[PDB]
Symmetry: C3
Subunit: 213 residues, 3 copies
């Protein structure tokens, strides 16, 4: 993608786990980010699901240069522009649309959009995309659905998200078409409150080590 | 929606159950409508699946003005225009398309379209819709699928239809994102054959009572 | 379809099984095709998943006149034009897109595109299509998903492909909405590589026989 200095591919190959973060209290954002990085996890997807999401991205971009912070739940060009202005290095959407694909490919940061069907995948491919999220992974029919969906497209790569846990992420990572998975367990909503970051570091370290072979 | 004097939201918040109606003999339409209204069920989806469907909508709008009569299985702008002219107060589609979303938003009655994936949901959201049918519910993976799909979208509301019955409607109604469900069991064929409209009134009454809490 | 001398329907009604072919070695294409025809299987889908695919289609169209050869994995107008020029009698795609639907209906050969949802089906129906692939059949939820999806569309017909084998093709063929199925087992990759043509003829004959009643 000519307008993207950082490729979507590089974002996904950084590590085997991309945490799907929901941040309710802004003050927890930076420490949380540092804790994840200290555990070996650098690509951070801050979902636009709370009022302070954009401000958390901005704060993490400024105070934690060691993170590759991005946005999640980007639903339209308007939000895409807002997270870009805030410093997102990448954007994730749970699905795709023509206006979002047009705005993203014309913009400066990579978009890795979710798909659930081959038709949706083909529409992203019409805009030159090769990297996608497979969301909701389990609900779309998990590993087997993903193996079927990917069968006719040898060059495509995914980051399945949705119902993935330490119990099954290895099943996904074993696939040739999968580069990494998205998960919510590295940052327990209740771990935030009270200032419990060592817990988060530990979980991240275990996620990374549990991913090998 | 600026062109819609009756909102899509008000159609779905009217009651917990929207009967999905397949009218084979025109003469049954009006008495069936009155019987459903007597039992407290007023939002009536007359599917464009039988030859007399548009005539039933027109007869119900004329003889049972208190019912909120609408059309179902609306597949394109041409059908939407026909049911609108016939007196439909709302239109339901099993899936969505851009010309259908465009024609609907340019028109006078609300469209509540079905979606099965987040991408389809996002395309509806680009036209500013917030109310959707989740069809076919069970085959799309039922409750869990809907819970995964709805997780990143806090403002959207659904009316799941497809495989819902007394056995499981409460499961769907309990979700925060669900306002009502679509079902076919309120109008049994044998009650019509018997002219036992009281059976239909009773079933509607039970559907509504069984939905509380 | 006015620009299609051969209807999409005639393609699907020719036989109960359409082999999904992956030809790695160009030299094996013609005798493979003759072996399938000798076993009673004429509609051949040569997928655009190998470098020699378009040449295989050309060689089969010229040399095995009793075969109805077409292309598979057609992803955009460019590929459609190319297989059209090489002699394909039909095109199959794993999903659909407006550009693909528009180029196909303006063209000379039938496109039977795959769908997974009612919205995808409706988009195809906006361009006048009545015949579709249901891909990936099993991952989409198999027979039940297909039954639910087709319930509101009495005129639509399908060719399910994806996870279908002798163990279950009968379950699909028994549906009133199914005209035939697509499968990969008649042409085992290892038989094509070695030139086991009597084996291929035998598998084809068993496929056809096992499909009755």
């Amino acid at each position: 993608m000519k307008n993207w200095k950082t490729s979507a591919e590089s974002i996904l190959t950084t590590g085997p786990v991309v945490p799907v973060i929901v941040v309710k209290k802004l003050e927890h954002a930076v420490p949380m980010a540092k804790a994840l990085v200290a555990g070996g996890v650098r690509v951070l997807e801050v979902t636009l699901r709370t009022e302070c999401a954009v401000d958390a991205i901005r704060a993490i971009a400024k105070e934690v240069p060691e993170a590759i912070v991005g946005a999640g739940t980007v639903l339209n060009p308007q939000q895409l522009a807002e997270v870009t202005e805030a410093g997102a290095q990448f954007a994730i959407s749970p699905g795709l649309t023509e206006p979002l694909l047009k705005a993203a490919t014309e913009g400066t940061i990579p978009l890795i959009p979710g798909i659930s069907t081959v038709s949706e995948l083909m529409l992203g491919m019409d805009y030159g995309l090769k990297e996608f999220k497979f969301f909701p992974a389990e609900a779309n029919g998990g590993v087997k659905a993903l193996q079927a969906i990917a069968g006719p497209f040898s060059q495509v790569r995914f980051c399945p998200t949705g119902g993935i846990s330490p119990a099954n992420y290895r099943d996904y990572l074993a696939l040739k078409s999968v580069l990494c998975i998205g998960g919510s367990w590295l940052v327990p909503a209740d771990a935030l409150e009270a200032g419990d970051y060592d817990r988060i570091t530990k979980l991240a370290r275990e996620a990374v080590e549990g991913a090998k072979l």
